[PDB]
Each structure stands twice: as C-alpha cells, then as structure tokens.
Assembly symmetry: C6
C-alpha cells in the first residue's frame, strides 16, 4: 500500500445550488420558518464564502435568509420559487466568474 | 514519501440508504422514538442535502421524520416497512436521476 | 505561491466522500477498572468496540449486536461512527462476529478481523 | 471487501497535514442589512472576509489588518481559520491587500486575488 | 488541475508514542494532574482504539490514566519515567502485532 | 473521474512557528492576555503534540503559556521577543531533530 503526504487546503466550489419548490411541513419546521414558499440551499467551499452567497441572495426582491453558516459553508433562504431560482443563478454566476469556482447545475425538487 | 496539495471539496454521494425492518428496543430508545415500525437511515454528502432527502422521504410515503442533520449529512425516519422502503427508493431515484449523485443500493437489516 | 513553485508541489482536487468499512471490531476480555469507569458501565464482563464508516452505520451495528447475543449497549454514536457494548466474553464475541459477517456478506463493506485484548 | 474487489478500487495511505494558503480575501462593499445582523456589527461600511490555512494564521492576518488601516475586527477565529473586519471600503481593501502581500511575499503562501462584491 | 473522488476511511496507525520525562508546571496544570512524574502521550487512528491503548497502559504498575478520548483518538497517562516508557512499548507492540498498525518510534522529551 | 480509497492518518508536521513582535491591541484582547510583549503561535500535527511543544516552550525561555489546545493542535505563548523566538527555535529544533517531523521556518510579523 503506497503512502503520500496530502497538504490539505479548501477547494473553491459550489457543490449544491438547489430549490425545494414546495417543502413538506416537516422541512419548514426543521428550519424554524414560515410554512410558505420555496427554500434555496447552497453548499460552498471555502466555508467563509457563505456570507458572500447570503449577501447576493438576500439583496434580491422576496428573499429572506433562513441562516448563514460560516462553520459548515451553508446558506438557506426562502422566497417564491422564481425569486429563489434567480438568486441561486446570481450566486452561481458570481462565484464562477469572479472567484473561479467550480459549480454545479441549479437543481430542483 | 512524496507530497501533493489536495484541494478538498465535498463529493456528491449517498453512502447509506438503509432500513432496519424490526429494530431492537435499545435502538428505538437511542433515537427517542415510538417502539413500533421500521427505521430508515440515510448518509449524504454534501451534508446540506439532508434537507432535500428528508423532503422527498416525507412526500414519498406516510413516514415520521426522526431528525434531519445538516451538520453530519444524516436523515432518519420511521414508518411501516413498505413506507420506509418507498421513501428510500424515492430518495435514491431522485439523487441518481435528477442530481447526478453517486448512490448505493437500498440495504436492509 | 513561492513554497509550492520552488518545491514543485503538484495540486489535485479531491472530492471527499465516506468509504464503506469496519476498521475495528474488538473485544477487551477483562477491562481494567479505569476503562469501565470511562464508559460509566458496570465493572463486569468484556467490552466490545466497533469503528464504522460511514458513521450512520453505527445504529445498524448496534441493532445486530443486541439481536445477536445477550449484551448491553453502552453507546451508539452516529457522530463518531462508534459502538461499544458489554457482556460475558462469549456474548460480546458473538455480537462482534455477527456485525462483521453482516457488513462483509450482506453490505459488501471492507472489514477487519475480530481482535482481542 | 466485495465492493472494493469487484470495483477494482485501489487503496493509498494519505498523511494529512494542513497546507499554507489564503483561499479568500474578499470585500463586500455595501452589505445587506441581514449580513451586518449575522455578524452582529454596526450597519455601516464594507466587510472584509479572509479564509486561511493553517487556521492558527487567523491571528497573524487580524494583526496585519488592524495595523494596515482604520478597521474594526469583527472576529478572529483560530478554530475555522477565518477573519472578518469592517470599515470604509478603502480601509478594508488596504487591510486585505496588506494581508495578501505579507502572506505571499514574507511567508511564501499560496494566495488568491482580492475579490469584491 | 486533475480531480479524483477520495473514499475516506480511517487508517490504522499510532502517530505518537511519547514520554515527557519531567513536565514543566504549566503542562501538569493543563492536564489537571498531580505535579509529579512523567506523562505518556498517544495519538491513534482509528480514534476508538484510544480505549484499547488506555486499557493496556492502565493495567501496568504505577500508571494512572489522565484521560481517554475516543473523539480525538488520544490517551495521556502518568507514572514514573520507566513505567511510562514500558507502557508506551506495550501499546506499540500490541497494535503493531495484533491490529497490523503502522507505528512510530517511542519518543522522549 | 476516477475513485480511490484514502486511508486517512495524521501527518507529522509543524506548519506554523510564528512570532508577532508587537501585536496590536485587538489581538492581545482576542487572546485575553496582558497588552505587553510578543506572541508566539504554533500549528502542529498530530494535534496531541501541542502539549510537547508547550513543555519545550516553557522550559526553553521565560514565557507565559496562553493556551495548549490538543483539539486543534495549537499553542500560543507570550514573552519578550527574544524569549518567544528562543522558545520557537527550541520547538522547531526538537521536532525536526528528535521527532523527525516536517517543519517550517520561524516566521515573524
């Protein structure tokens, strides 16, 4: 079995840019939010970029930030489906173009 | 021994999609749940996808969500064996077909 | 940067996912008093210790252990992927064997042998 | 195990150590109200955000930032390797530039460019 | 830049088997122990093996376990220098021979 | 994209051995220390070696240990610039020459 030294640094990636269009009651309940609208879910690396993603999403009409987590690199936000989708697009486009991030497709459930 | 720089990012994978058909008493007690029915257990990466899997499980079948853990990337839920298996199948199908995630088989004990 | 350039250190992206493995399935036949005290358990019998990946499989291993033999579960830890349980040596070994056989034969996970101290 | 054998998945030992890198040196010029609220800071000025490895270098970056320009440190986090600070846009950019130049030129760390939103 | 999927599992290794022969006061103070004797320090992977190492060390004459940490994979114990050294040797020999661990030399400060 | 199994173990490395010669007030305040003298900062792997580095630092020179963190693998200490530099030098020499660890230069700001 070969052995190597791995110098570990964070990559630059959005691994999830997702809208739950019509969450079930239990999902609203676990976030502690109003049981209305869609939920956007973002996974980012490095984790500090959560605050940047939350700032992009929360600037848009109809978007309320549910939480910004710099410890896990996660953002969740609420809005109508169309607002949530375009804010996910704003995040993907900013991070791809400006920070050279690897990105995933916008996904929907 | 050589040295390489590793840019660490989360992968996109379900590593466990499991039903315990007839849990022992100690296992119901560790989850704090009613001592009836089957338990479904899911391991996901990136961890934020736990909320997506919980939403699919609750919409797929008459199950009770035990917890949704975005910190560990884990979901557990309860219901009759058929209901829990339906929920696991719907998670695995959606994550594979719609998210392009790596998946595992639906496993049973 | 300078360290990387002058060291000619290469760079790769690694997508991290958990593997599927039992890395420890161990019986302490006759624990010392301090080990029983650290688990907060009765100072009698053997202790079984299991290390699993991914960590959520701890609850599956605990269920098999308790169904396999007359053991008392000490803890089931889905945060660390760990299970510990207690009982007479033969019961603890039976439970460890049943965990290894299920994970190897039904799940196809990588498994270590049963080890004893 | 069966999954590994039939998938012909190879196995390597990786000795994990931290690298030496700034992965983020970023100014939010005009934060939204919710971002100021999440940091618990005055709702005025730009925010600077730094991601460092190894995480203990957060205190070094905070010291440079505060010495470089009239900024207010929001937090210094040696557990996550993170620094955030606030001030007028030109002060926040000066502090980020001074962090990048010190880490690149004095320490030889890998560094990203200064980024703006 | 190449990209690979890393299936992460714990290795089997003792990375540290160390005796501080005559700790300074501050080191005794940080462990909350009597300011006498040497300190043995063990780093193990997987972390659950801390309990096995603590059982081997604590069985020996003169050894008191300071702490056993299954969350970090760490053990610290106290005794006279010679007892601490032979207990570190007992741990290294058990884990190398029985569990096939990679091991380091016994080190001393 | 190919897949490999990575057996993860800690490496043996000091990644930071740093003196802040004249800290700003906010930095003394974040550590909760007297606003006088230099600060030494050490990053170690495996994390248990923090206690070994703290012991060497305290025995090397007239320094005050701020914290010894075996959870993060970190040590910080305070003293006059000469004392702090002596302590960092003794840590780097011992870890390189006696433990066979990878080290970094003694760095200054």
């Amino acid at each position: 079995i070969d052995r190597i030294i791995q110098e570990s640094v964070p990559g630059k990636q959005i691994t999830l840019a997702h809208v739950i269009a019509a969450p079930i009651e239990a999902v609203y309940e676990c976030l502690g939010v109003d049981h209305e609208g869609a939920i956007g879910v973002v996974s980012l690396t490095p984790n500090e970029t959560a605050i940047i993603a939350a700032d992009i999403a929360g600037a848009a009409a109809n978007i309320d930030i549910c939480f910004v987590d710099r410890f896990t690199g996660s953002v969740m936000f609420s809005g109508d489906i169309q607002s949530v989708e375009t804010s996910l697009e704003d995040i993907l486009e900013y991070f791809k173009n400006s920070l050279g991030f690897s990105t995933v497709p916008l996904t929907k459930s």
